[PDB]
Structure formats: structure tokens, C-alpha cells
Amino acid sequence: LYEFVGLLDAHGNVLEVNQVALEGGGITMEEIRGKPFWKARWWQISKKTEATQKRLVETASSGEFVRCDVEILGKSGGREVIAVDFSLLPICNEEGSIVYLLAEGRNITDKKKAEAMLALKNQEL
Amino acid sequence: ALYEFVGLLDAHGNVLEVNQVALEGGGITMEEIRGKPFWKARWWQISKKTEATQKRLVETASSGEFVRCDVEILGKSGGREVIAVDFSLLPICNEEGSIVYLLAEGRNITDKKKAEAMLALKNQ
């Protein structure tokens, strides 16, 4: 189940975003509505992270189901980085034309947590 | 055309997100409807018949069939007033093809129908 969710048009302009994602980034609808999703502050760690989001939007708009782990300015009202399992789902109309994209973010398990999980299981056996 | 009201439903039609324009128009809070079937929400509650219609439309989209039709809803003045809406449901599939969400959209056509009524009188 997602944590962050957003609705984009086919070109990646922002239409709707849930409050959890806005509060996490310290971002308002007024700042991002109708402007490309990749320009919003969550994606602004670097020119590289913004370029990755732009490519994830463009490829989704071409009908790919894309997903990858990303770091975003998405905790403590945008002051801190979190890692997110990000996806875009193309949404087609009744003719098969992509008209929207559904952006979803889920939490990622800390590396040290996963290591602790396996250490504990090996130890419990 | 771009929607005025929009909602995201799960594969079974339970409400996940709705825009503020639809909530304010219907006089509905996100807590009253989240995680519960879309046809139970107040927009669809003019009668048992309207609710049954929305239930069947949701179930149709849940099978992958796209829906568009005109409907009336309790959607203006905090749920006090009925408006006519051009309504659609888009099934959203994952890459495997399974339906994972439904997108509900609507545009108020109350003033379009009144303008068509006036044109019909003028033409006479």
C-alpha cells in the first residue's frame, strides 16, 4: 500500500498529490500544481536526480511500467532525505491512449535492518 | 476534457483519495469514506436506485470495462443540491494486466443541460 501518491497528466504535470507527500516535502499544491513533477522539490537533490525523474515520467508516458529506488527530499518538511520505492503506472483511456500517470511511493527497509533480520534468523535456527 | 471531481479507488471500489472540490461539493470528509465502497458515499445517495446504479458501475469497471455516463449526484452546497455530472470510471491495470485501481472522474454538466434546454426553446 502506498505512502505517497500523486496524479499526473500524460506529460507529467502535477494534478493531485496526497497530504502525506506534501507534508513530507514541506511543499504546497500551489507551488507544484500544473508544473512538471520532476521540478517539484522532492526530486531536487541534484541535476541527476531531477533528470532521473524526468526520464521515469517520459518513459511511463510511453507506456512503460517503471519502478526504482530513489532518494527524495521527503522527510521533516523537506529538510531530510528518505529512500523510497517509487513507481509510475500509465493510466489509459477507453481508446488505449495514456491520459494520466499514477505516481506512488513506498518505504524502503534500512540496509542495517535487513542485515539484522538475516543475522537474527541464522542465529535462531 | 479535464475532470472537475476525481477519486482514486482500489480494485474493489473502496475509496483511497478524492479531491477537495468533490469533498466540499458533497459535504463529505475523507474519514467518512476512506476504505469504504465508493457507492456508499453521499454523492450517490439520492435513492436506493442511485446507489444500486453506482454499485453496478463500480463492479463493471472492476472487471476492466470502461464506464461513461450521465448521472445526478448530491454534489453542490455541501450535499444539499443535485447536479448533473458526466461521469467516468477508468480501470487501471498493472503490467500483468490485473486491475489494481479505478479512477473516478466527473464534470458538472448542469449548466450545459440548461443551455441546451434554452436552445430548444429558441429554435421554436
Author numbering:
A (entry chain B): 43 to 167
B (entry chain A): 42 to 165
What are the paper's exact sentences on this?
TodS/TodT, a two-component signal transduction system, is responsible for regulation of tod operon expression in P. putida strains. TodS lacks a transmembrane region, and its N-terminal PAS domain (PAS1) binds a wide range of effectors, including toluene, to trigger increased basal autophosphorylation of TodS, leading to a phospho-signal relay to TodT and ultimately transcriptional stimulation of the tod operon genes by interacting with phosphorylated TodT in the PtodX promoter region (11–14). In the present study, we determined the crystal structures of the TodS PAS1 domain in complex with either toluene (an agonist) or 1,2,4-trimethylbenzene (1,2,4-TMB; an antagonist), as well that of apo-PAS1. The structure of each PAS1 domain is very similar to those described for other PAS domain structures, which consist of a five-stranded antiparallel β-sheet and three α-helices spanning residues 45–149.
Toluene is a key signal effector required to activate the TodS/TodT signal transduction system. The overall structure of the complex is generally identical to that of apo-PAS1. The agonist is positioned in a hydrophobic pocket formed by the hydrophobic residues Phe46, Gly48, Val59, Ala63, Phe79, Trp84, Trp85, Ile114, Val126, Phe128, Ala145, and Gly147 in each PAS1 molecule. In detail, the benzene ring of toluene is placed into the area formed mainly by the aromatic amino acids Phe46, Phe79, Trp84, Trp85, and Phe128. The PAS1 protein was titrated with toluene, and the ITC data were integrated and fitted into a “one set of binding sites” model, which yielded a stoichiometry of 1:1 and a binding affinity (Kd, dissociation constant) of 8.5 μm for each molecule in the PAS1 dimer. In the PAS1 structure with toluene, the corresponding region is dramatically reconstructed into an α-helix. By contrast, in molecule B, tilting of the Phe46 aromatic ring occurred only in response to the agonist toluene, and this was linked to the formation of a salt bridge between Arg148 and Glu146 and the transformation of the flexible STR region (in apo-PAS1) to an α4 helix.
